[PDB]
Design a protein around this nucleic acid. Structure first.
Ligand code: RFV
Ligand code: MG
Ligand code: ZN
Lengths: 1112, 14, 7, 104, 158, 102, 221
DNA sequence: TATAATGGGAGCTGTCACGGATGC
DNA sequence: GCATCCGTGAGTCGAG
């Protein structure tokens, strides 16, 4: 079908590679393709440079490193539950000072995980994404003192865990105090330690309001730098002997040590720009020629007093400003942990240098890789920033990679997080999305990188702007930091242009975020596109300008939760961004160069290029994602087809012909229906299940281990005691269920028999054994069975065994068996559907086709939405989408309406007019005049002021159709709906919250160890939690016995629950409940706390709840 | 406060 | 992730 | 009788020793091989109770006919294993120690 | 101290705390028996008090005791009682209970005010003992156990 | 309507046949739309046989003809078979009323 | 430090070592005290580390073997650039060591895991919360045992009290233990052959009744 | 069982909203 | 009498 595009806005530059943040960060960190001599000092190279050389005497030194090739490919890593990684080798040389002996060797440092093409990782078999972290940029800041209005607080912040923060404050008594490690001391002392004399501070700071006299102390200048140093060491270290070299060492470690105290390169630059100075190193001072020299403190104190005085050209700082907040990407985090591990390695190296044979030692004998390995591994497995990949659809992964988190190590803690942090700053413009975030606890803490936004080498987010010179808009684009953005006047992207010239006398622009109307002479820069203001998810919502920001948020988030459908379609109304998202997520398979397609198979596509070479592309088919959704590619081409460079070859998951498909385009009618759509519930047509709209494949993994025991070995076998052939029907020789067998709850996926625990037969068992004359078997049935509510078809079985080639499991484990079960889920009552505009609901009713409201020509509607959902929520985008959707339904064409530049009303009306011609003129030609029902409805609409009275029925029907409304007949009656109804095509997705997953119930089941209460969770077949608030509920109702049941009979009263069950199955009323076991546990815990808990009677005479078992 | 520092002090006495 | 169920 | 009240008070060292079914003289938990409790350890069946219902440690008396009977060889009473939830032990300090709750 | 599914052991932190206590104590008894100097016995006694403290309330005074290779404080008795996860709030004033379930809600228009739509399977599992009883009351099953074994598999349902 | 499908060398619906572009899910999706007219009022069930191979596009016509059975939509596409691509099917069509899910 | 014992614990054990050194020292050798002390200090510390740091105690020689296995494996991994298999370690440990021995050694060295380890981001999840108690019988199992006792009493009342009591004493339903033929024969005042005979006929009548009503078949699992 | 070896390291940083105890 | 320090609180089910 024809795709008609709208909008007058011409994008100068396209969207940058979306995963570039991840891939370029990590690539920058590793420098694996850079030859060792050409490596810049950054990342792991910089880590090595920091750690080495190591001294104390022997000396171990660094030369270079190298990263080898992965021992296993990505897919193989995924299957064998390995980690995709490359070996890390390091060239070192040991040097004895005295002997002059030099020994050079390449030592093996363990492995570093490699980032895959799409910008993810594989850790222990699982796909994981490292989420970039937002934090406060290192540097020097000056912020208003909350208590004292006239005064200020100076702060010097280094990189996280790179050493302590420092606070310079002017005290009420007049002396300037410095706070380090929560210790207040006069700054004068430190200034003396740096080698400053009263003269220097007098001439430098004298110009001010006599704050300098607070820095003037006679007792301080009365002692030389050594004495002042020992003084300071005595001040900061109570109890620690004030040795000279120890004091120098400590103060140097706190201030001038690059190995300990480090500002970022960002902190470096920022401090330079703020204080108006130039830094040599990244520290606050130096140790040079035996003494200490001051780089920072004096400029800082100077600026502080200059801010206090009111001197022009001095200002406070906004810590929420995105010029003051930066991003630590994958590379920086990984490098940080690498540096930590390396430090541990150096500690171990020195410790090994002290003792041991002093003659024979090699870099191999000094270096233990264990701390470094454990460090990196700790980072990738257990770090809060290393997250299980969101695989639901490709957009999920793509968005996951673009996530910006304020949480994690060194980051914020929620419940500690205020409003100011969560707010949208004016500098978020073009950088971080104002819309997409969570609704709950994490709101404003987790955000998304804007579409055109970029992260520079310093870690600041930058957004593009077009250069404007003398009213002429160039094609030259400049990416700016927020600080640089603040310097200009930036016009809006929708402002009129003839050619490259601004066509308006009054143009809308921004100055420091503040909106201002200026002349084209004043415009320095202009917005690239409205697209740059939002994220990728938000940019996928058509007619966004008609939606309230909150519902926009909801839809934006909800797209990530869209489940891939077998029949999935692209939206009828797109934003034009639907293709790029698929292309960048590497879901779809494309053509590398121009050429002809040799072969097309369901499993493969073979392509001959202009190079004459045959390149074969294999297809991923029905793979299980992290969320259980089926990710599979399907070929879109045919044998012999000519294809240029970049043409589509295979269609990825949730993709239709290269366009992003999150759901179906269905024909909707917006009317209340018999209370079935009441309160956001949704009614769907059975014709949707008939043609398999909203049908999705899901795969679940089941795993079982047979190990060695002290009671004898477990084994996978088809031989299961006390079971029939009926139960073993689908089991093969080995005991594993066959491929293609249908499995239902209770079925056996994998047979297993474990040797019974030592068992003393109860007398009844012995007697019954004598009666039936059957030996009690030595093994019992542990076989892995399909959980309740689960089941499907068995599409794969994996068997690993100890003693098989390439196979070694964790110690004690003989064999591991995995069974993959795929199920094809139709839509059903309880499943969740949503649009892109934030309308969400559960299907409450599936009507037969004949009940469904239909058009005069006999066409039924798929979905009946409730109108009541629109006004309160204020998302009008769905309405327009619906109208244009109706037009596109009858004209057989789709559309592209970009955000903020798109199809407006009149054009939609024209399209609806043409559509009306196709929908009606045909009918007139078919020899059918206006229906009586249409007459009645037209009378009604005429009374409603919808149509102009006096016109012919055709004219009024066209008038209604133009307003996007049509005549609708109720399927049960045949009578028309009294009014005209809005009907049209809408794009709706099936979200991953599915009733089939969520439904659970239990009578009795497993109980906890200590508490003796029912386990939690559906997976554990546990019970629902009745909490303090539910207890309050029951109390307010004054239902005593119900509550007592919950507290006793239903949970944790052992004798009581057993007796109750026995009674019920017997047909007897339930017994009086007794003391809940958790209270006995309370009593015993308190006794363990050396407190005596006595349950008495009214006689104050002890009552024993333990029934004597606890008393000698 | 810190037991280690205390013990190192007591040791530092003899 | 919380509120009335965006995520 | 019916329980109408609940009293809490400081336990005397003598009362603590009264609760205890024995002293734990060893840090040990269970044996690295037999996977059974050690002697005078935290899990010891001598003190806290039998692991199997009405069966002693060595296995000399396996039935309910012996109830309250403490085996001579293995030193383990035969009763309902549930007592392992109910039976306090104790540790005899070399020096008195202040209860943290009352100090801090 | 319990063996999990994999054949691996899992245990409570109170065991590690008790072990600390017992070890430091015994070492003190031997140090006294051997007549060690003061500045030794003192250190030992101090460490003993801190051991008891760590056991009863951990992280209450000074640094919290941690397991080797972890930043996680060990769980002491005070922690077991007090807190939202504590014994009182978690296991006493509230509980996980039997004969219960959950699911997604959908509006019945047709329901009378006093009624609710209950899924068949949910009800079957919720009411299961009663269903066994009424199955023995009729000729559907000889006894309870037969009825239960009959309901276990889904393809055995009639 | 078509009530069942068996393909040789295919264990379940979720699998792909070598030489065949369409996955079995899609093949069954296409088979759903097959229109089978019974000339005999007494005939409750028919099993259509299809055997095809080589480069070709297997359509509804390729079903082996049965007495008193007519395919009302012979142009209906079923599969796209490549060189060496081999498809062998037995489909079961029945008389029924309404919509009965698999 | 870091070997499983606290700094102060190490210090105290080292103090014990120092004491041993003092009591064993001989000044006649003209050696400084440090030299002879260091040996005993290191010895006591090492002994402590071996005898303590494991929650489940392992013999000191065994700990030595395990650590030797670890050094061996680490050397092998440093030379091979990968984690060694069981066979490579076996070969590297010399004779007597096969793959099975290495595996059993590693298995026996497995440390326990905390029940209070969190399974999630929040304070909510504890590992122990997912662990079912297998010890105490379920309500279902209890009710089935009860119905078993009741049905057995049903079928035992269909006999005469003598044969019922003989069966009851022989299978140990009464005291929980099984009497021999001599004891039931001495209690009922008949021969062991006779008591075994009435036990036979009781059991046989029970077999007939069971073939008839089939009430006791469902309890056989 | 013996050259002599004699004071430790990591902190870790954008919450208030306080309650009662303690201090010029 | 009034600044200052230390300890203890900071929503619910669900899955994890
Ligand atoms: C390892 O991190 C865990 C918690 C650490 O603790 C904390 C303290 O630190 C973080 C960090 C650094 C984050 O950025 C979080 C975050 O962005 C959240 C939610 C959290 O609670 C986050 C947490 C913490 O709670 N909201 C989102 O991400 C939303 C906007 C989109 C993605 C949703 C899908 C459903 C997830 O991505 C999912 C596939 C999975 O990955 C996570 C649930 C992950 O669980 C695991 C198994 O990986 C969490 C994040
Ligand atoms: Mg060998
Ligand atoms: Zn015994």
């Amino acid at each position: 079908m024809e795709i008609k595009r709208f909008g007058r806005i011409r994008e100068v530059i396209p969207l940058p590679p979306l995963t570039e943040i991840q891939v370029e960060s990590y690539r920058r960190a590793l420098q694996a393709d850079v030859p060792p001599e050409k490596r810049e000092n950054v990342g792991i190279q910089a880590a090595f440079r920091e750690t080495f050389p190591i001294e104390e005497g022997l000396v171990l030194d660094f030369l270079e490193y190298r990263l080898g090739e992965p021992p296993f490919p990505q897919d193989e890593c995924r299957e064998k539950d390995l980690t995709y990684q490359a070996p890390l080798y390091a060239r070192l040389q040991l040097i004895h000072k005295d002997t002059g002996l030099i020994k050079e060797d390449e030592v093996f440092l363990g492995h570093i995980p490699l980032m895959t093409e799409d910008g993810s990782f594989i850790i222990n078999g699982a796909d994981r994404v490292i989420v970039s972290q937002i934090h406060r940029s290192p540097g020097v800041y000056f912020t208003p003192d909350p208590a004292r209005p006239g005064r200020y607080i100076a702060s010097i912040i280094p990189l996280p865990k790179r050493g302590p923060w420092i606070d310079l404050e002017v005290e009420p008594n007049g002396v300037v105090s410095m706070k380090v490690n929560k210790r207040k001391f006069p700054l004068v002392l430190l200034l003396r330690v740096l080698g400053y004399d009263q003269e220097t501070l007098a001439r430098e700071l004298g110009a001010y309001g006599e704050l300098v006299q607070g820095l003037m102390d006679e007792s301080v200048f009365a002692m030389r730098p050594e004495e002042a140093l020992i003084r300071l060491f005595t001040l900061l270290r109570p109890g620690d002997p004030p040795k000279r070299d120890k004091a120098v060492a400590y103060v140097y470690g706190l201030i001038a040590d690059p190995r300990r105290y480090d500002l970022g390169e960002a902190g470096r630059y920022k401090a330079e720009e703020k204080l108006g100075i130039r830094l040599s190193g990244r520290t606050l001072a130096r140790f040079e020629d035996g003494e200490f020299k001051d780089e920072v403190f004096l400029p800082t104190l100077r600026y502080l007093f200059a801010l206090t005085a009111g001197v022009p050209g001095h200002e406070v700082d906004d810590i929420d400003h995105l010029g003051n907040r930066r991003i630590r990407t994958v590379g920086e985090l990984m490098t940080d942990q690498f540096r930590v591990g390396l430090a541990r390695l150096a500690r171990g190296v020195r410790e090994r240098m002290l003792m041991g044979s002093e003659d024979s030692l090699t870099p191999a004998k000094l270096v233990n890789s264990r701390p470094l390995e454990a460090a990196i591994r700790e980072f990738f497995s257990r770090s809060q920033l290393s997250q299980f990949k969101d695989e639901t659809n490709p957009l999920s992964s793509l968005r996951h990679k673009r996530r910006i988190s304020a949480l994690g190590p060194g980051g914020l803690t929620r419940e500690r997080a205020g409003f100011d942090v969560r707010d949208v700053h004016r500098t978020h413009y073009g950088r971080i999305c104002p819309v997409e975030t969570p609704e709950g606890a994490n709101i404003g803490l987790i955000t998304s990188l804007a579409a055109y936004a970029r992260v520079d080498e310093l870690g600041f987010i930058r957004t593009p702007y077009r250069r404007v010179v003398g009213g002429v808009v160039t094609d030259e684009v400049v990416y700016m930091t927020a600080t640089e953005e603040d310097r200009y006047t930036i016009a809006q992207a929708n402002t009129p242009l003839e050619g490259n010239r601004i066509a308006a006398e009054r143009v809308v622009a921004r100055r420091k975020g503040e909106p201002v109307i200026v002349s084209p002479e004043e415009v320095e820069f202009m917005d690239v596109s409205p697209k740059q203001v939002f994220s990728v998810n938000t940019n996928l919502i058509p007619f966004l300008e008609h939606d309230d920001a909150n519902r926009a948020l909801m839809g934006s988030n909800m797209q990530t939760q869209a489940v891939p459908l077998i029949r999935a379609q692209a939206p009828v109304v797109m934003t034009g961004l639907e293709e790029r998202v698929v292309r960048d997520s590497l879901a779809a398979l494309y053509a590398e160069e121009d050429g002809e397609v040799a072969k097309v198979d369901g499993n493969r596509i073979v392509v001959r290029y202009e190079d004459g070479r045959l390149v074969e592309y294999p297809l991923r088919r029905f793979y299980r994602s992290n969320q259980g959704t089926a990710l599979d590619q399907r070929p879109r081409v045919v044998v012999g087809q000519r294809v240029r460079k970049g043409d589509l070859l295979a269609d990825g998951p949730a993709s239709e012909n290269g366009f992003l498909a999150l759901g179906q385009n269905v024909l909707v009618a917006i009317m209340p229906f018999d209370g079935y759509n009441f309160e956001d519930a949704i009614v769907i047509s059975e014709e949707l299940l008939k043609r398999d709209f909203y049908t999705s494949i899901h795969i679940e993994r089941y795993e079982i281990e047979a190990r060695d025991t002290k009671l004898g070995p477990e084994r996978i076998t088809r031989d299961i005691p006390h079971l029939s052939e009926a139960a073993l029907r689908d089991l093969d020789e080995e005991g594993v269920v066959r491929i293609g067998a249908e499995v239902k709850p209770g079925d056996i996926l994998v047979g297993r028999t474990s040797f019974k625990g030592e068992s003393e037969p109860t007398p009844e068992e012995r007697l019954l054994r004598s009666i039936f004359g059957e030996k009690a078997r030595d093994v019992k049935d542990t076989s892995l069975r399909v959980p309740p509510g689960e089941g499907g078809i068995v599409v794969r079985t994996v068997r690993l065994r100890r003693g098989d080639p390439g196979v070694e499991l964790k110690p004690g484990v003989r064999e591991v068996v995995r069974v993959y079960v795929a199920q094809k889920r139709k839509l059903q009552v309880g499943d969740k559907l949503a649009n892109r505009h934030g309308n969400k609901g559960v299907v409450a009713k599936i009507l037969p086709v004949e009940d469904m409201p239909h058009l005069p020509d006999g066409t039924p509607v798929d979905v009946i939405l409730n109108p009541l959902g629109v006004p309160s929520r204020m998302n009008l985008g769905q309405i327009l989408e619906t109208h244009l959707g109706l037009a596109g339904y009858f004209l057989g064409q789709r559309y592209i309406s970009p955000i903020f530049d798109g199809a407006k009303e009149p054009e939609i009306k024209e399209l609806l007019a043409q559509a009306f011609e196709v929908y009606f003129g045909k009918r007139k030609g078919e020899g059918f005049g206006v229906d009586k029902r249409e007459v009645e409805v037209l009378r009604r609409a005429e009374k409603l002021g919808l149509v102009t009275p006096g016109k012919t029925p055709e004219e009024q029907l066209k008038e209604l159709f133009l307003q996007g409304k049509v005549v609708l007949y109720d399927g049960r009656t045949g009578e028309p709906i009294e009014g005209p109804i809005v009907v049209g095509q809408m794009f709706i997705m099936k979200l991953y919250h599915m009733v089939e997953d969520k439904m659970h119930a239990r009578s009795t089941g497993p109980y906890s160890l200590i508490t003796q209460q029912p386990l939690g969770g559906k997976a554990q077949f546990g019970g629902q939690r009745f909490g303090e608030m539910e207890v309050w509920a029951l109390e307010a109702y004054g239902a005593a016995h119900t509550l007592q049941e919950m507290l006793t009979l239903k949970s944790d009263d052992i004798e009581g629950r057993n007796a109750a069950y026995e009674a019920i199955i017997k047909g007897e009323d339930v017994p009086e409940p007794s003391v809940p076991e958790s209270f006995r546990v309370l009593v015993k815990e308190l006794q363990a706390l050396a407190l005596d808990v006595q349950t008495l009677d009214e006689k104050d005479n002890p009552v024993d709840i333990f029934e004597g078992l606890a008393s000698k | 406060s810190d037991p280690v520092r205390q013990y190192l002090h007591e040791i530092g006495q003899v | 992730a919380x509120x009335x169920x965006x995520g | 009788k019916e329980v109408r009240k609940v009293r809490i008070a400081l336990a005397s060292p003598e009362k603590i020793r009264s609760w205890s079914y024995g002293e734990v003289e060893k840090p040990e938990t269970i044996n690295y091989r037999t996977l059974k409790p050690e002697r005078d350890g935290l899990f010891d069946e001598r003190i806290f109770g039998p692991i199997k219902d009405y069966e002693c440690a060595c296995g000399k008396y396996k039935r309910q006919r012996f109830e309250g009977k403490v085996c001579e060889r293995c030193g383990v009473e035969v009763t309902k294993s549930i007592v392992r939830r109910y039976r306090m032990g104790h540790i005899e300090l070399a020096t008195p120690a202040a209860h943290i709750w009352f100090v801090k | 101290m319990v063996q999990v599914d994999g054949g691996r052991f899992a245990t409570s932190d109170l065991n590690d705390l008790y072990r600390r206590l017992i070890n430091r104590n015994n070492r003190l008894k031997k140090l006294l028996a051997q007549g060690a100097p003061e500045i030794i016995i003192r250190n030992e006694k101090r460490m003993l008090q801190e051991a008891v403290d760590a056991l009863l309330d951990n992280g209450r005074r000074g640094a919290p005791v941690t397991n080797p290779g972890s930043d996680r404080p060990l769980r002491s008795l005070t922690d077991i009682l007090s807190g939202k996860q504590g014994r009182f709030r978690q296991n006493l004033l509230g509980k996980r209970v039997d004969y219960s379930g959950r699911s997604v809600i959908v509006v019945g228009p047709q329901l009378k005010l006093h009624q609710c739509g209950l899924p068949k399977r949910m009800a079957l599992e919720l009411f299961k003992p009663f269903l066994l009883k009424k199955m023995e009351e009729k000729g559907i099953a000889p006894n309870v156990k037969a009825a239960r074994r009959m309901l276990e598999r889904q393809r055995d349902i009639k | 309507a078509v009530t069942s499908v068996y393909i040789e060398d295919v264990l379940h619906e979720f699998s792909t046949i070598p030489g065949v572009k369409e996955d079995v899910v899609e093949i069954i999706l296409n088979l759903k739309e097959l229109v089978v007219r019974f000339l005999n009022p007494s005939l409750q069930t028919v099993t259509l046989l299809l055997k095809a191979e080589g480069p070709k596009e297997v359509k509804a016509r390729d079903f082996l003809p049965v007495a008193d059975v007519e395919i009302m939509n012979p142009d209906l596409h079923i599969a796209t078979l490549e060189e060496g691509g081999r498809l062998n099917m037995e489909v079961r069509v029945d008389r029924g009323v309404g919509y009965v899910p698999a | 430090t870091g070997r499983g014992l606290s700094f102060l614990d190490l210090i105290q054990e080292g103090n014990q070592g120092l004491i041993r050194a003092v009591e064993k020292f001989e000044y006649k050798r003209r050696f400084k005290f440090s030299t002879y002390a260091t040996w005993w200090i290191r010895q006591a510390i090492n002994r402590a580390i071996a005898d303590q740091a494991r929650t489940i105690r392992i013999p000191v020689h065994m700990v030595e073997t395990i650590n030797k296995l670890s050094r061996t494996a680490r050397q092998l991994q440093q030379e091979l650039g990968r984690e060694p298999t069981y066979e490579e370690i076996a070969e590297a440990m010399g004779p007597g060591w096969d793959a099975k021995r290495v595996e059993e050694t590693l298995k026996i060295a497995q440390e326990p895991v905390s029940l209070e380890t969190p399974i999630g981001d929040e304070k909510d999840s504890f590992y122990g919360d997912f662990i079912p108690d297998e010890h105490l019988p379920s309500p279902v199992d209890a009710a089935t045992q009860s119905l078993l006792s009741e049905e057995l009493e049903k079928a035992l009342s269909k006999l005469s009290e003598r044969e019922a009591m003989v069966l009851k004493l022989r299978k140990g339903l009464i005291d929980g233990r099984e009497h021999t033929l001599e004891e039931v024969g001495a209690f009922f005042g008949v021969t062991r052959e006779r008591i075994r005979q009435i036990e036979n006929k009781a059991l046989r009548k029970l077999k007939y009744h069971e073939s008839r009503t089939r009430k006791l078949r469902d309890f056989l699992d």
